[PDB]
Design a protein around this ligand. Structure first.
Ligand code: L2P
Ligand code: L2P
Ligand code: L2P
Ligand code: L2P
Ligand code: L2P
Ligand code: L2P
Ligand code: RET
Ligand code: RET
Ligand code: RET
Ligand code: MYS
Ligand code: MYS
Ligand code: MYS
Ligand code: MYS
Ligand code: MYS
Ligand code: MYS
Ligand code: C14
Ligand code: C14
Ligand code: TRD
Ligand code: TRD
Ligand code: TRD
Ligand code: UND
Ligand code: UND
Ligand code: UND
Ligand code: D10
Ligand code: D10
Ligand code: D10
Ligand code: DD9
Ligand code: DD9
Ligand code: DD9
Ligand code: OCT
Ligand code: OCT
Ligand code: OCT
Ligand code: OCT
Ligand code: OCT
Ligand code: OCT
Ligand code: OCT
Lengths: 231, 231, 231
């Protein structure tokens, strides 16, 4: 484990995702509202999945070597197995908050799968220049997601209860800022141009992951928007 | 790329799926009917997924070598990753058109997963004679799907609006004819008996894919069956 | 095939899953109740999936070698591909029986995916002591599932029709007893401590699989709880 300088950030990430999972699990014990139960189930699964994948990276299972640039490059593939399941769950939290229609939910989840799937292909591609073709396709899929979150959901939240509109607006802004950083870290990190070393890259993804999952969840599960209007 | 004679058909397929995706995306911009939005989302995702997998084959990522018959045989595995997601989406288009019940939808999607999954196992199997055992199981799963589309959905469409009944009947006939060709191309192509060479096999799958996805989508999204009855 | 002593139990399992699939398929022909159709579709898919994965193990495709303990250990990875899809389908049978809320269904299916996913990682892990870390995480996920089936569903079934309450109680008890045996067989078998040899381990999993899928299905599909109350 300790033979890799980035191990400290993988261990911290593992701990923070595990602690986040347990807090949400305990906090959700005393909840019977069927609407609130939906948000607790979605939001608790997110850091639980991330916990297992951070642990796999810490123990060395989620790491492979990819030859490109005449070098064997360490690629943590477990990140994409994490994101494949956690990013659509996070979008479902937002879509259920605004009572989005089914067709829009399917478009979001499908574009998200394309985003993560093409990012994985780009991470494992051995022809250096082709890695950035996949990065560009994946980034186009992300821009579609961000467009929908702004010019489809925002207008839908305003016609909703005030507390669900204000909570959505906050979580929307958090998501757009944090998610946009991921393609940048990829491009300048060891998967892309190799400007930033792997140990610093790992620290950046850990800050982003914890903020986008545990920070996101703390804002959502403390809001009254997750409960139905009741007397 | 150009070192493979089949590259021209992979490049054409990539272009036609990309163009198809963009047309459906633009055409769906001016749509607010929640029913129509469902069909546009399903139908636009189909060629978008196929685009990415054709590109992976063009660039050489979606290709592996499988030893059988005393030879290293080029097997494009990316086809099955495509079909795993696009064939159930196409069946969902048909099932939603006739307002099929949930139990029937699950049976269709499950049989479809078995069809594609066993076809993938057959494509990667190293014992030559066993490849055709998997082909037979996969073909049995397809025949179940075709039976349901005829002796379960057809009777359901007649009790529906006339425009949804006539549109379903057309898309049903297109699907049964085109899908039935796939097991035949597999059997006589490089995955099976090896009668037809890979470059011709690739041309045939490209014609079938574009017809079953973009041609299918053009018929559906030009129909009024996708809109609810409104004044 | 016959070069492996466990082949006899893989062949028996294949036959019993295939026969089970055909019986459920025939029995479900004469069913039009939309509620009953749901249970028949879920319950017939379970042994059909298991059939294909037992066949892959029989023919040698679903087997790999994992080095640990200074030895190349035969690991049947196809079991986890089976369980990944069949265990959530079995939980869906139970959840639909008691009309569970959506949030609870998602929590069950998500915990089940974590259970199977971490068990697969543990089966393929090359550092011997780490294999049991994954076993423990997977077992914690199972205990969560069992808790929900007892202290969330049981109370919900009592407020239901008497026949659905008594049928659920029976299937609940069958599930908790049979599922609990799996982590024990893993721990003492070739994936874990290696006390029980592989051929005996394979026999035990076959008895458990057939009971948990075909036996489970025979109890459910003979009950009147799967039909709506009708005159
Ligand atoms: C009902 O809706 C509320 C349940 O949602 C919340 C239910 C959760 C979604 C269930 C998923 C958690 C499982 C219990 C998994 C247990 C293993 C975890 C990875 C444990 C990690 C923390 C600890 C080991 C440090
Ligand atoms: C509606 C939305 C959900 C739609 C989703 C969008 C999606 C279509 C976007 C594209 C996804 C696609 C790129 C997934 C590729 C997975 C692949 C990286 C797995 C590893 O295989 C890659 C190479 C080794 O580098 O295999 C070496 C050769 C091996 C012999 C490969 C044989 C196994 C194949 C991988 C079998 C295909 C399985 C499916 C891809 C499983 C789904 C994986 C997940 C990442 C989507
Ligand atoms: C709301 O419902 C309508 C949206 O459906 C339609 C929405 C679509 C389903 C969203 C999926 C498309 C994404 C925007 C993916 C973008 C990358 C594409 C693969 C681009 C391919 C064409 C071009 C690069 C040649
Ligand atoms: C309700 C419906 C959706 C049900 C679906 C029906 C489905 C059950 C039908 C059978 C599907 C099954 C054959 C999928 C097999 C995937 C497999 C080809 C992936 C590549 O692995 C094959 C060998 C190399 O040749 O791995 C070499 C050895 C490696 C060490 C393998 C270890 C990884 C395992 C593959 C882990 C299992 C992952 C799941 C199979 C992922 C789903 C893939 C998709 C193709 C279903
Ligand atoms: C409508 O709801 C009822 C259909 O459910 C029941 C429908 C089933 C869920 C459909 C799935 C079965 C498919 C027909 C697959 C056929 C291949 C099987 C694996 C055959 C195995 C048995 C035989 C080959 C020994
Ligand atoms: C809501 C719920 C459904 C959530 C589900 C819970 C889930 C997150 C729990 C953890 C699942 C995770 C451990 C799955 C790992 C699959 C992995 C074993 C496949 C084989 O790859 C392992 C190594 C060889 O030993 O690959 C060698 C290196 C290769 C180069 C690997 C590159 C391919 C990657 C495997 C791509 C990721 C694909 C996804 C993991 C596909 C889903 C598989 C299924 C088992 C979940
Ligand atoms: C909890 C994890 C989250 C919210 C991860 C989000 C990840 C992304 C938005 C990743 C995007 C990428 C691109 C847009 C292209 C480059 C490759 C990716 C996958 C890093
Ligand atoms: C857009 C792609 C489509 C509609 C693909 C359809 C593919 C099939 C219907 C494939 C069927 C197969 C068999 C029936 C057995 C032989 C292997 C397959 C997977 C080619
Ligand atoms: C039809 C198959 C069924 C119902 C299989 C159930 C399997 C389990 C409940 C497996 C559980 C495991 C653990 C709890 C940890 C050890 C590894 C597993 C996956 C065997
Ligand atoms: C979206 C965030 C990207 C900003 C990356 C900042 C990295 C600064 C760290 C110093 C770079 C290390 C280079 C010298 C080793
Ligand atoms: C009462 C609110 C705080 C509860 C404690 C939460 C502990 C989980 C770890 C959170 C750290 C990361 C927060 C986002 C920066
Ligand atoms: C379902 C369509 C299958 C028909 C295949 C027709 C192939 C004819 C092309 C000529 C065969 C090439 C053999 C000589 C190289
Ligand atoms: C107005 C209808 C035609 C629009 C142009 C569609 C261009 C997408 C490519 C379609 C070619 C394949 C059609 C099926 C044979
Ligand atoms: C949950 C069931 C686990 C019980 C396992 C009993 C196995 C007894 C078979 C004899 C053990 C073989 C050891 C000598 C070869
Ligand atoms: C009339 C009920 C029996 C029908 C025959 C079922 C045959 C399928 C194989 C069942 C054997 C396994 C039963 C569970 C132990
Ligand atoms: C194995 C991959 C299957 C999933 C394909 C994605 C489409 C799923 C459609 C689900 C239809 C709704 C069923 C109720
Ligand atoms: C990782 C594979 C999980 C999918 C298994 C297929 C069954 C899914 C059941 C979904 C139940 C409906 C939830 C609302
Ligand atoms: C185009 C939709 C408007 C909202 C999206 C904001 C774009 C942020 C740019 C992200 C940069 C990634 C490289
Ligand atoms: C048996 C259901 C009737 C409709 C299915 C038509 C069968 C077409 C044969 C396809 C040939 C594939 C080898
Ligand atoms: C803790 C929830 C109560 C019901 C679960 C029964 C636990 C059975 C123990 C299984 C042993 C697996 C190692
Ligand atoms: C080795 C660098 C080659 C540059 C390729 C950049 C491709 C980016 C595509 C974005 C449209
Ligand atoms: C090398 C050819 C061996 C023939 C096997 C055919 C199997 C087909 C099974 C269809 C029932
Ligand atoms: C080689 C045996 C090492 C023992 C590790 C046991 C780990 C079990 C963790 C359960 C909390
Ligand atoms: C609940 C605390 C979980 C912390 C265990 C993971 C941290 C790795 C320490 C080496
Ligand atoms: C929108 C046009 C997309 C065409 C790019 C793919 C074709 C491959 C050319 C080499
Ligand atoms: C319907 C009977 C299915 C039996 C075939 C599988 C058994 C393997 C025999 C070698
Ligand atoms: C993106 C930063 C999240 C901050 C988490 C703190 C929330 C406390 C209510
Ligand atoms: C299967 C052939 C499809 C033909 C596509 C043309 C549709 C234009 C309306
Ligand atoms: C767990 C044992 C199941 C027994 C199956 C027999 C059911 C006949 C109704
Ligand atoms: C009005 C809410 C502002 C939230 C933005 C937070 C950016 C990290
Ligand atoms: C909408 C604000 C985008 C912020 C992008 C930050 C990328 C590091
Ligand atoms: C009555 C519609 C006929 C459609 C069949 C088209 C076959 C390619
Ligand atoms: C229902 C007509 C089937 C046509 C099969 C064509 C196979 C090449
Ligand atoms: C295995 C075939 C079953 C025969 C019919 C059983 C009575 C519905
Ligand atoms: C009251 C029903 C008892 C069922 C338990 C069966 C254990 C195999
Ligand atoms: C609730 C009874 C548990 C039985 C466990 C059996 C494990 C072999």
């Amino acid at each position: 484990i300790t033979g890799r300088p980035e191990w400290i950030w993988l261990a911290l990430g593992t701990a923070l995702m595990g602690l986040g999972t347990l807090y949400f699990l305990v906090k959700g014990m005393g909840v019977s509202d069927p609407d609130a139960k939906k948000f607790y189930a979605i939001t608790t699964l997110v850091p639980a999945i991330a916990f297992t994948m951070y642990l796999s990276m810490l123990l060395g299972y989620g790491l492979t070597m990819v030859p490109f640039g005449g070098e064997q490059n360490p690629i943590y593939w477990a990140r994409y197995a994490d994101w494949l399941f956690t990013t659509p769950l996070l979008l479902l939290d937002l879509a259920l908050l605004v009572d989005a229609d089914q067709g829009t939910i399917l478009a979001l989840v499908g574009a998200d799968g394309i985003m993560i799937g093409t990012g994985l292909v780009g991470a494992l591609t051995k022809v250096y220049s082709y890695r950035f073709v996949w990065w560009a396709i994946s980034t186009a899929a992300m821009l579609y997601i961000l467009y929908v979150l702004f010019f489809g959901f925002t207008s839908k939240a305003e016609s909703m209860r005030p507390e669900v509109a204000s909570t959505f607006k906050v979580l929307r802004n958090v998501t757009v800022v944090l998610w946009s950083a991921y393609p940048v870290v990829w491009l300048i990190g060891s998967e892309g141009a190799g400007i930033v070393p792997l140990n610093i890259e790992t620290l950046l993804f850990m800050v982003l992951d914890v903020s986008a999952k545990v920070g996101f969840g703390l804002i959502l599960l403390r809001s009254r928007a997750i409960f139905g209007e009741a007397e």
